[PDB]
mmCIF file of C-alpha atoms and ligand atoms in Angstrom:
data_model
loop_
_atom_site.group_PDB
_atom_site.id
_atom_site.type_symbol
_atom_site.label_atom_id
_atom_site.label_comp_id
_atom_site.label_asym_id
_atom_site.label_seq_id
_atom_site.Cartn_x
_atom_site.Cartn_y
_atom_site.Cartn_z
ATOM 1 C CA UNK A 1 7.788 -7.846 -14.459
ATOM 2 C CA UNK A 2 10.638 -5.977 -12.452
ATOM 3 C CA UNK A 3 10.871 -6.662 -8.770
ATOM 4 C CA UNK A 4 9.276 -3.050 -8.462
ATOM 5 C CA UNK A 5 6.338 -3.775 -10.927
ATOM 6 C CA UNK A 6 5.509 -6.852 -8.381
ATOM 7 C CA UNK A 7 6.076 -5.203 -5.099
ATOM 8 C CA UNK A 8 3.380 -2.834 -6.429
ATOM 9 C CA UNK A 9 0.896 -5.114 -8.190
ATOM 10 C CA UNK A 10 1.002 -7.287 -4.533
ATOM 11 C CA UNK A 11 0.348 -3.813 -2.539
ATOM 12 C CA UNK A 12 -2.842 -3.405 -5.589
ATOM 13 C CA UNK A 13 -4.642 -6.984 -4.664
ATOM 14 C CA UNK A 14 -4.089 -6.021 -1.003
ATOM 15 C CA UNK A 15 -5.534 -2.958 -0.729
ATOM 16 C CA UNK A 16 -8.477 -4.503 -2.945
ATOM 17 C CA UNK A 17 -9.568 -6.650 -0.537
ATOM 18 C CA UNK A 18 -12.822 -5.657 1.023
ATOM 19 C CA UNK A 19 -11.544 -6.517 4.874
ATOM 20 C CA UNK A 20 -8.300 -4.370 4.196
ATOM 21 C CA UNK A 21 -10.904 -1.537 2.501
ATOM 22 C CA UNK A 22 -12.228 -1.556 5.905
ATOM 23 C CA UNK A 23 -8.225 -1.175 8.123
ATOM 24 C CA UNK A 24 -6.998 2.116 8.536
ATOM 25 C CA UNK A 25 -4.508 3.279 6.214
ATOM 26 C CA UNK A 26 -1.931 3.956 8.731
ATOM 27 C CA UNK A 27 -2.041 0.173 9.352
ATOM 28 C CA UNK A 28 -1.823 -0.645 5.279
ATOM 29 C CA UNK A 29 1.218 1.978 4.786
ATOM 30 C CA UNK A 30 3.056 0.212 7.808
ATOM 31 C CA UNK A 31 2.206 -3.502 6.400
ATOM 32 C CA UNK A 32 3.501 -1.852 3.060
ATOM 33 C CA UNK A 33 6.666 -0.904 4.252
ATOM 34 C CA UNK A 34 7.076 -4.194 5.914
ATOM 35 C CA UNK A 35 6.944 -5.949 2.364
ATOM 36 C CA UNK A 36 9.675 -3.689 1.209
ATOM 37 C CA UNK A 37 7.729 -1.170 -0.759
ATOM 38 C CA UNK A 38 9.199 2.629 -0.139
ATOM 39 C CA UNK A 39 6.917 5.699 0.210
ATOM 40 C CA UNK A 40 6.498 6.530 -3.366
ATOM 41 C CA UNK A 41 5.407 2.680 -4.661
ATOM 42 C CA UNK A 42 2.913 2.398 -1.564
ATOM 43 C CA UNK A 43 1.745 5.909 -2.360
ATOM 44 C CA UNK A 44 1.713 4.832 -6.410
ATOM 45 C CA UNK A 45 -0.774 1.620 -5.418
ATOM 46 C CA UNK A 46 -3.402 3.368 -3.481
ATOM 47 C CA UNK A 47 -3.472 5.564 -6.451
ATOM 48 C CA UNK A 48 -3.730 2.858 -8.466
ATOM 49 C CA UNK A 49 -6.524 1.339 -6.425
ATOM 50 C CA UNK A 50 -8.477 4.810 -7.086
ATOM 51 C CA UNK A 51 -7.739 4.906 -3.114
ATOM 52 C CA UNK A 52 -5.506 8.147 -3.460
ATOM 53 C CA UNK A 53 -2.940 9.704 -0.745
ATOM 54 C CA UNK A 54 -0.972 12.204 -0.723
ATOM 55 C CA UNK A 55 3.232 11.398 -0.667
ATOM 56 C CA UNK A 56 3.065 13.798 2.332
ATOM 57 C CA UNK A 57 0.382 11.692 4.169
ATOM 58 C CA UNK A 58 2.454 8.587 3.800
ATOM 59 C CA UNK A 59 5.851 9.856 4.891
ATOM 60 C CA UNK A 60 3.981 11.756 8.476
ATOM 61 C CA UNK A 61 2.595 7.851 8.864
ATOM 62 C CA UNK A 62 6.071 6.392 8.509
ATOM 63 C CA UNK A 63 8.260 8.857 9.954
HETATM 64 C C1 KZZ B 1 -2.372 -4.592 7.546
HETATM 65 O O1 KZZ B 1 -3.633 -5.287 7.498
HETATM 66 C C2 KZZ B 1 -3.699 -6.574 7.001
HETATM 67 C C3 KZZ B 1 -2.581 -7.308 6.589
HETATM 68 C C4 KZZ B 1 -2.738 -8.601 6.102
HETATM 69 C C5 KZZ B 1 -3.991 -9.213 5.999
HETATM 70 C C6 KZZ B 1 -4.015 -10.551 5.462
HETATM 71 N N1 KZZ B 1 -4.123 -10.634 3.967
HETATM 72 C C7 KZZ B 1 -5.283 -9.913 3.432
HETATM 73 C C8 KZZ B 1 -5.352 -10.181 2.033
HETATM 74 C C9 KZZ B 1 -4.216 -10.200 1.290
HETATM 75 C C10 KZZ B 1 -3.024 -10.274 1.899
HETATM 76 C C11 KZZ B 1 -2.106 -10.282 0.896
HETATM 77 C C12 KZZ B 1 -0.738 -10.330 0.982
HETATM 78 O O2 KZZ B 1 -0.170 -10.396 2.070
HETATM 79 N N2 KZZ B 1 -0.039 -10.240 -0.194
HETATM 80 C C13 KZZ B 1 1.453 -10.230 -0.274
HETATM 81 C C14 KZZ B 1 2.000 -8.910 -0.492
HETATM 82 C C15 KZZ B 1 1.200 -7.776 -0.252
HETATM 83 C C16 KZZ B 1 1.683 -6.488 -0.451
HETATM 84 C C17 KZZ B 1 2.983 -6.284 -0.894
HETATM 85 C C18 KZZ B 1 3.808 -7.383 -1.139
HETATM 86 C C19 KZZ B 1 5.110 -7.146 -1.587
HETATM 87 C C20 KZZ B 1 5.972 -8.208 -1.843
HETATM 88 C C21 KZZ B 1 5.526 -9.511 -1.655
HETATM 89 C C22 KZZ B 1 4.224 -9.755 -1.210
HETATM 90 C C23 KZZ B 1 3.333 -8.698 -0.937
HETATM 91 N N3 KZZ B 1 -2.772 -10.204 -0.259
HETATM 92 N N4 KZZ B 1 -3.998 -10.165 -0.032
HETATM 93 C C24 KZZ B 1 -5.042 -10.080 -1.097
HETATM 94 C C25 KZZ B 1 -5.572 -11.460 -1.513
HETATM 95 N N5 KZZ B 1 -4.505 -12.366 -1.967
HETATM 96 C C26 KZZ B 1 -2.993 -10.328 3.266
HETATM 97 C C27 KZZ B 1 -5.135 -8.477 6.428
HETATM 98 C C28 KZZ B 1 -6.440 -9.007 6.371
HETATM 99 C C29 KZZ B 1 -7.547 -8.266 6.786
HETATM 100 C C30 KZZ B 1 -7.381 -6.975 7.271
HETATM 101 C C31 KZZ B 1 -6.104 -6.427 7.341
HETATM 102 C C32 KZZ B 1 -4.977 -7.159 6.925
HETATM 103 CL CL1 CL B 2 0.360 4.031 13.645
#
């Protein structure tokens, strides 16, 4: 796995967990960020997560 593939696969089991379900997701994008994950791969594993956001949503969080 690329360094990508596992930045995003970590950001998937987190946002699984049911006490993160329950955290806001302005919270989640700025953990997200903190683990070096940019706009589009934290936007790509909420998607992945069937949680989906829009690219806009998660740019007005971290701007
Ligand atoms: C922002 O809110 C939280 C952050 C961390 C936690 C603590 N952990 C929850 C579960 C959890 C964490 C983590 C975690 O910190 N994973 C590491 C990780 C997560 C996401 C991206 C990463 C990127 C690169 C390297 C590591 C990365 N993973 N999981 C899923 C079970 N293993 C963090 C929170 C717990 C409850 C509610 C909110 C939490
Ligand atoms: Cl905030």
């Amino acid at each position: 796995h690329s360094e990508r593939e596992k930045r995003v696969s970590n950001a998937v089991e987190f946002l699984l967990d049911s006490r993160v379900r329950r955290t806001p997701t302005s919270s989640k994008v700025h953990f997200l960020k903190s683990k070096g994950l940019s706009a589009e791969e934290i936007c790509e594993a909420f998607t992945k997560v069937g949680q989906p956001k829009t690219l806009n949503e998660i740019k007005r969080i971290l701007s």
